[PDB]
Design a protein around this ligand. Structure first.
Ligand SMILES: CC(C)C[C@H](N)C(=O)O
Ligand code: NA
Ligand code: NA
Ligand code: NA
Ligand code: NA
Ligand code: NA
Ligand code: NA
Ligand code: NA
Ligand code: NA
Ligand code: NA
Ligand code: NA
Ligand code: NA
Ligand SMILES: [Zn+2]
Length: 866
């Protein structure tokens, strides 16, 4: 399997302008008839090369003439001797029931549905399966009426009929030209939640959410969130929906989260279905996020699409940015920002130091489904947010408007978007463009000096990006570096120089530079990299007192949280070293007192307090170190929790009781209170055992919502409380028939700190609620074990690695996309000690030798073993 390179992009030899599809649907054998109107742009002797995978070709016609000048090659149908313009007709057969990979047309329970992004449409018929080929689609679907009473595709229904033998048909038309990755088809029997939204200018849009029979009680929040997405896009970005109908279909078998197929989004049911007894606050907010995300793609992705897949971030980084702004505007901006930063520092930074490192706009790709990454998505969004930071909101929106004005109806590039932003704002983004082409995380080193004689404060800022596995050459970036200087009373010192205000976003563009501020009347405590203003590692020699001062005084909530993270980081590192020496946890009294102050400060937003009181995950902890000791990290996180639970016991219980709420509501103030309360409960669970057991079991049994029940159950597991087994069995007995709800329980099994967790996880492969056929089950058990139980996954005997090899041996053949997702923990081997590294290598070597190794795994394994 051969890499493709961005620099090899060339406009296509042929275009397709219109495609008429007919599906004669059956799960065992579907017959597809595709009639395309084509135009040659290249040389008269260049053949038409159509992509196709696992198709059974029945016939090829060119202007109704059966064609002889063609051949099939690996992954292609190559047609020679064509006129300049012509009708292509292909008939081919496919087999949805055999499609375990869930790419193309496949079966989800009794439904048939598609997933075409990135290169799935070629599993349906022979086509120019590349996103710079846009065409107007009409789609006729013919099927058994009892099995498939609903037959859906993109756009509007234009024709309908009934046939003999209990078959019927429906034809759809979508007036907007699209790349084929945005094609969708769904067939099945559903309950349908129907509603309407009227856009700002008066267009009435029929909203239809299709869910499995019996699930309509779990549909209203997703519908509500769609309507909120539509309104918000109008208010913030001035964008309205452009069709008559908006359909969403929730399917249980889906490799990823959700898909923005024009007018017919297809969602993993995990990001649709919610009721207060089945879904947590975090599920509600995830659903809101993802519904929004796919909606936002209607403009950033569909009305302007991608020229080639190396431009994926053009839509994904921008659309994540939009989903984050949506979430932030509707909810707590601080909490949104905190948690996006946790993901960047804790998961994205790890990718950017791994063998799979790539720039947000990749240069080389073997399997494009491997590049739906933290980097393309989350770091992509940080790059868009940097543009926002540099331009300001009004200029940013002018840029968005210029982008759409230039590129509406076409496929564009990352560079086109940056150019629009530059031209509309008159901000020079030439240097900035290097964020698109350079991989790895910049390290920004800051030193300071205060000169009491001149009242000048000098920051000396330096940057460098270390080399990564993919790029040996690195250069300085245009880093927007936001600061705020605090005096001894906690007030902001105005930033200025030579009598002029200075913008608080510093342009850090060189390897080294100095910034000098005047009229600095007191030695400042700085807030540096405010609101994580660039996706960089910050090296600054903070004192504990500067950090506790920020936790008390900083103006932005985010900076209060971030100061706490820097305070903890020091002691996390101390205590990992101590764990390796066999020593107890050491923590200064003044660090504990800082957290006591947060617990007792009645001015602090509970949402913020809750996040300060949520320790960094084991993934965020791992980013503090060059070589990761995952056992020491897990034990340190546990010991730090135990120490704070003891020290803060009375305060924790008082805050726990004070935030009790008898009504459950999905409302942001209520969520914040509950999050603080359950944060307190987490510490209490790790305190004196008897009290813990009582609090936790009572919360579980008395909870009137899944947030409170799960928080209690999760604490019982994490602290290994006496009540654990009984509560876990109760949840199983009550919820085993509900896969989404059981996913939570599988995650808690997989992430258990118990000594025999791997034995228990292996046994759960035979659980009544588990199946290797369902990506969500796989990810909640196997994936959570490998990815979120690094202490057990990285057990010294290598047992974790061998278990993952066994699972991947199956998944490599069954569902390579899910396999590739699950291999990630193994490809980080260079972060671990020599002995783990050798075992991880031997596991990778074994996988490399699989018969029929998928391209998905091959790409990652070869990078890892280099
Ligand atoms: C591969 C696709 C399911 C990903 C989708 N375009 C998203 O960003 O939500
Ligand atoms: Na020709
Ligand atoms: Na076209
Ligand atoms: Na799109
Ligand atoms: Na808000
Ligand atoms: Na996240
Ligand atoms: Na988020
Ligand atoms: Na593939
Ligand atoms: Na420029
Ligand atoms: Na200094
Ligand atoms: Na990490
Ligand atoms: Na089972
Ligand atoms: Zn997306």
């Amino acid at each position: 399997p051969q890499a493709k390179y961005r620099h090899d992009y060339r406009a296509p030899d042929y275009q397709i302008t219109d495609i008429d599809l007919t599906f004669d649907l059956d799960a065992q054998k579907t017959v597809v008839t595709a009639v395309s109107q084509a135009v040659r742009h290249g040389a008269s002797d260049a053949p038409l090369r159509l992509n196709g995978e696992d198709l059974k070709l029945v016939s090829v016609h060119i202007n109704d003439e059966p064609w002889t000048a063609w051949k099939e090659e690996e992954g292609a149908l190559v047609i020679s001797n064509l006129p300049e313009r012509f009708t292509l007709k292909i008939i081919n057969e496919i087999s949805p029931a055999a499609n375990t990979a869930l790419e193309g047309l496949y079966q989800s329970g009794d439904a048939l549905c598609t997933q075409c992004e990135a290169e799935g449409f070629r599993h349906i018929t022979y086509y120019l399966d590349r996103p710079d080929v846009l065409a107007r689609f009409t789609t006729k679907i013919i099927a058994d009426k009892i099995k498939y009473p609903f037959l859906l595709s993109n756009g509007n229904r234009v024709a309908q009929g009934e046939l003999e033998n209990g078959r019927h048909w429906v034809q759809w038309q979508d007036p907007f030209p699209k790349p084929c990755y945005l094609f969708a088809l769904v067939a099945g029997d559903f309950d349908v939640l129907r509603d309407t939204f009227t856009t700002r200018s008066g267009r009435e849009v029929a909203l239809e959410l299709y869910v499995d029979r019996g699930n309509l009680d779990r549909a209203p929040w997703a519908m509500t969130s769609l309507k909120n997405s539509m309104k918000w896009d109008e208010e913030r970005f001035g964008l309205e929906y452009d069709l008559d109908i908006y359909m969403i279909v929730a399917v249980d078998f889906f490799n990823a989260g959700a898909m923005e197929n024009k007018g017919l989004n297809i969602f993993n049911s995990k990001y649709v279905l919610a009721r207060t007894d089945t879904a947590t606050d975090k599920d509600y907010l995830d659903i809101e996020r993802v519904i929004g995300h796919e909606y936002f793609h209607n403009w950033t992705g569909n009305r302007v699409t991608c020229r080639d897949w190396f431009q994926l971030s053009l839509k994904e980084g921008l659309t994540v940015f939009r989903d984050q702004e949506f979430s932030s505007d509707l909810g707590s901006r601080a909490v949104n920002r905190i948690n996006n930063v946790r993901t960047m520092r804790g998961l994205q930074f790890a990718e950017d130091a791994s063998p799979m490192a790539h720039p947000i706009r990749p240069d080389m790709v073997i399997e494009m489904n491997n590049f739906y990454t933290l980097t393309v998505y989350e770091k992509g969004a940080e790059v868009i947010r940097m543009i926002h930071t540099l331009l300001g909101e009004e200029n940013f929106q002018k840029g968005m408007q210029l982008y759409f004005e230039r590129h509406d109806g076409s496929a564009a590039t990352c560079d086109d978007f940056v150019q629009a932003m530059e031209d509309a704002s008159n901000v020079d983004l030439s240097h900035f463009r290097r964020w698109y082409s350079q991989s790895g995380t910049p390290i920004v080193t800051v030193k300071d000096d205060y000169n009491p004689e001149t009242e000048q404060y000098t920051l000396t800022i330096s940057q460098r990006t270390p080399a990564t596995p993919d790029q040996a050459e690195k250069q300085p970036l245009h880093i927007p570096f936001a600061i705020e200087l605090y005096d001894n009373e906690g007030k902001v010192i105005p930033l200025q120089k030579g009598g002029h205000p200075v913008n608080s976003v510093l342009n850090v563009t060189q390897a080294e530079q100095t910034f000098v501020f005047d009229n600095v009347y007191f030695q400042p405590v700085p807030a540096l990299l405010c609101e994580f203003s660039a996706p960089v590692k910050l090296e600054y020699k903070w004192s504990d007192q500067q950090l506790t001062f920020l936790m008390r005084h900083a103006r932005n909530d985010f900076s209060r949280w971030d100061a706490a993270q820097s305070l903890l980081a020091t002691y996390i590192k101390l205590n990992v070293a101590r764990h390796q020496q066999g020593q107890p946890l050491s923590l200064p009294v003044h660090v504990a007192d800082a957290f006591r102050a947060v617990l007792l400060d009645e001015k602090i937003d509970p949402a913020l307090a809750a996040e300060i009181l949520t320790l960094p995950s084991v993934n965020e902890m791992a980013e503090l170190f060059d070589i990761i000791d995952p056992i020491a990290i897990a034990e340190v996180r546990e010991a730090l929790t135990r120490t704070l639970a003891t020290e803060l016991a009375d305060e924790l219980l008082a805050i726990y009781n004070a935030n009790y709420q008898s009504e459950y509501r999905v409302e942001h103030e209520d969520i914040a209170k509950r999050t603080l309360r359950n944060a307190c409960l987490r510490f209490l669970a790790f305190g004196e055992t008897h009290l813990a057991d009582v609090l936790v079991s009572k919360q579980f049994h008395e909870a009137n919502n899944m947030t409170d029940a799960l928080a209690a159950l999760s604490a019982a597991v994490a602290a290994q409380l006496p009540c654990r087994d009984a509560l876990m069995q109760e949840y199983d007995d009550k919820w085993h028939q509900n896969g989404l709800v059981m996913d939570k329980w599988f995650i808690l099994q997989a992430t258990s700190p118990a000594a025999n967790v791997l034995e228990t996880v292996r046994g759960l492969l035979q659980h009544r609620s588990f199946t290797m056929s369902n990506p969500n089950r796989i990810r909640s058990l196997i994936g959570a074990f490998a990815g979120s139980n690094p202490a057990a996954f990285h057990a010294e005997d290598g047992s974790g690695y061998l278990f993952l090899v066994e699972m991947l041996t199956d998944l490599n053949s069954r569902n390579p996309q899910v396999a590739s997702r699950l291999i990630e923990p193994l490809i980080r081997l260079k972060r671990y000690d020599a002995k783990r590294q050798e075992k991880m290598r031997a596991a990778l070597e074994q996988l490399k030798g699989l018969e029929n190794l998928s391209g998905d795994l091959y790409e990652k394994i070869t990078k890892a073993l280099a």
